[PDB]
Amino acid sequence: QPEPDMITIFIGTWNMGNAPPPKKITSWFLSKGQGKTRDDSADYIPHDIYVIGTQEDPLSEKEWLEILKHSLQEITSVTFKTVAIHTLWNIRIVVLAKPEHENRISHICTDNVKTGIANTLGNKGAVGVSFMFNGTSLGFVNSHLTSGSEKKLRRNQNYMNILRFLALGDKKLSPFNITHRFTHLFWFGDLNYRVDLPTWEAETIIQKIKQQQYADLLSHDQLLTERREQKVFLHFEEEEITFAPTYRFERLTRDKYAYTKQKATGMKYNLPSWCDRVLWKSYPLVHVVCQSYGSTSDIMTSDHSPVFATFEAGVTSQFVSKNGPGTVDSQGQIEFLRCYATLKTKSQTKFYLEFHSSCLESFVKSQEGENEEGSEGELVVKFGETLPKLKPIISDPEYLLDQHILISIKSSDSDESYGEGCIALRLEATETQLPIYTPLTHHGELTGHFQGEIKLQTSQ
Ligand SMILES: N[C@@H]1CCCN(C(=O)CCC(F)(F)F)C1
Ligand SMILES: N[C@@H]1CCCN(C(=O)CCC(F)(F)F)C1
């Protein structure tokens, strides 16, 4: 029985509006409705992993697990295994996998983050799950961010708190937040970004939706505009949106958007918006392809419609050689030439690098770099040819070219990371000097760049 080099992953997000679901929700798991939808010829083909995020979920974990498992069994005739379930207040994540994957999955972690303070602490935040699937790390975040059209900055703050404080994946990756810990990271939920147009344009917006003309609405979507200005979700992807706004509907139909201010809304308008979203970030040069992104048309218990997204995702096997794991393979090495970090910091400490990778027995600390002043004000930290030679556990190019090196640049004075990034070893050539590059971030904001050259030696 061969190990897979690809899997498919279903991501669902649904704000259930504190109402039980209807008796049939299979269209959600089949990616049928509006947008980029899944071919009918695939309906019986189970996804490898289903990740379900709910918000305003009124059900117990038991109640929802029974609905989800029975739904997937009806679709696929497969009885899925429960990988993980985690609930904060009414925010929930469920991970289900095909039974054949049970002994491919390990290191399962769950966590939550509560956003806000006092007033604004009590119902928003995020839940997440991570695990290893053979050689590949997978992370999943379901967030319910702050509501309201005039709170985009609060949503951006909620995002930064979640990526700082959600404790998933390998704790040995201490300088790295969740935006660097996984081969593939999926972040979804009721992110609550709105279409920023004047209230008076409500009926115009509805018109446009009825005509399936989304371009003039998407150009005012706060998540797309905030992402363009690098205010949030830096270095994440989202498929093009080709489905109608998923909020705010009258319940029990999809024929009506309920946008007008009511006591029940705190006298706020809810112009039609794409509140419910799926984004991802994968390590450089790993296969990931969105195969569906859309909303259901036939699930109408909530004022939100469910959103689905599906992905092909590259995975690797749990590699064993005669040497590593348990030793190094002297036929492998990773060298760095002419490397330098460019940092936005105004500080003057010395810096050193840490290299982290599951291709190393443990992380590697460099010597301090040499600080110079850039011609436009910047700090340039030069490592020259001084960086340590990295000794991978396995030299086989079928393993090594699939790996990645995480880099942290740390202050000698405080040992605090000023920037984190990632380099792929999926090179065009071995035993050849090749350019490398990563942006550096800290708390998910841009702090600098790392560039230089790499020389990778494999057993071939
Ligand atoms: N093909 C690259 C993928 C990642 C960043 N890129 C964007 O165009 C981001 C646009 C926005 F505004 F949606 F963020 C380019
Ligand atoms: N532990 C690995 C499993 C698969 C391939 N391997 C061998 O064939 C080892 C041969 C010898 F001579 F070391 F025993 C190494």
Swiss-Prot record:
GO molecular function: inositol-1,3,4,5-tetrakisphosphate 5-phosphatase activity; inositol-polyphosphate 5-phosphatase activity; phosphatidylinositol-3,4,5-trisphosphate 3-phosphatase activity; phosphatidylinositol-3,4,5-trisphosphate 5-phosphatase activity; phosphatidylinositol-4,5-bisphosphate 5-phosphatase activity; SH3 domain binding
Subcellular location(s) of the protein: Cytoplasm; Cell membrane; Membrane raft; Cytoplasm, Cytoskeleton
Chief subcellular location: cytoplasm
Membrane spanning residue stretches: none
This protein's GO CC annotations: cytoplasm; cytoskeleton; cytosol; membrane raft; plasma membrane
Keyword Lipid metabolism belongs to the record: yes
PTM (free text): Tyrosine phosphorylated by the members of the SRC family after exposure to a diverse array of extracellular stimuli such as cytokines, growth factors, antibodies, chemokines, integrin ligands and hypertonic and oxidative stress. Phosphorylated upon IgG receptor FCGR2B-binding.
Gene Ontology BP, a term: negative regulation of natural killer cell mediated cytotoxicity
Record-annotated disulphide pairs: none
Assigned keywords, A-Z: Apoptosis, Cell membrane, Cytoplasm, Cytoskeleton, Hydrolase, Immunity, Lipid metabolism, Membrane, Phosphoprotein, Repeat, SH2 domain, SH3-binding
Free-text tissue specificity from the UniProt record: Specifically expressed in immune and hematopoietic cells. Expressed in bone marrow and blood cells. Levels vary considerably within this compartment. Present in at least 74% of immature CD34+ cells, whereas within the more mature population of CD33+ cells, it is present in only 10% of cells. Present in the majority of T-cells, while it is present in a minority of B-cells (at protein level).
Family per similarity comment: Belongs to the inositol 1,4,5-trisphosphate 5-phosphatase family.
Quaternary structure note: Interacts with tyrosine phosphorylated form of SHC1. Interacts with tyrosine phosphorylated form of DOK1. Interacts with tyrosine phosphorylated form of DOK3. Interacts with tyrosine phosphorylated form of SLAMF1/CD150. Interacts with PTPN11 in response to IL-3. Interacts with receptor EPOR. Interacts with receptors MS4A2/FCER1B and FCER1G. Interacts with receptors FCGR2B and FCGR3. Interacts with receptor FCGR2A, leading to regulate gene expression during the phagocytic process. Interacts with GRB2. Interacts with PLCG1. Interacts with tyrosine kinases SRC and TEC. Interacts with c-Met/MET.
Protein's job: Phosphatidylinositol (PtdIns) phosphatase that specifically hydrolyzes the 5-phosphate of phosphatidylinositol-3,4,5-trisphosphate (PtdIns(3,4,5)P3) to produce PtdIns(3,4)P2, thereby negatively regulating the PI3K (phosphoinositide 3-kinase) pathways. Able also to hydrolyzes the 5-phosphate of phosphatidylinositol-4,5-bisphosphate (PtdIns(4,5)P3) and inositol 1,3,4,5-tetrakisphosphate. Acts as a negative regulator of B-cell antigen receptor signaling.
Domain comment in the entry: The SH2 domain interacts with tyrosine phosphorylated forms of proteins such as SHC1 or PTPN11/SHP-2. It competes with that of GRB2 for binding to phosphorylated SHC1 to inhibit the Ras pathway. It is also required for tyrosine phosphorylation. The NPXY sequence motif found in many tyrosine-phosphorylated proteins is required for the specific binding of the PID domain.
Protein name from the UniProt record: Phosphatidylinositol 3,4,5-trisphosphate 5-phosphatase 1
Organism per entry: Homo sapiens
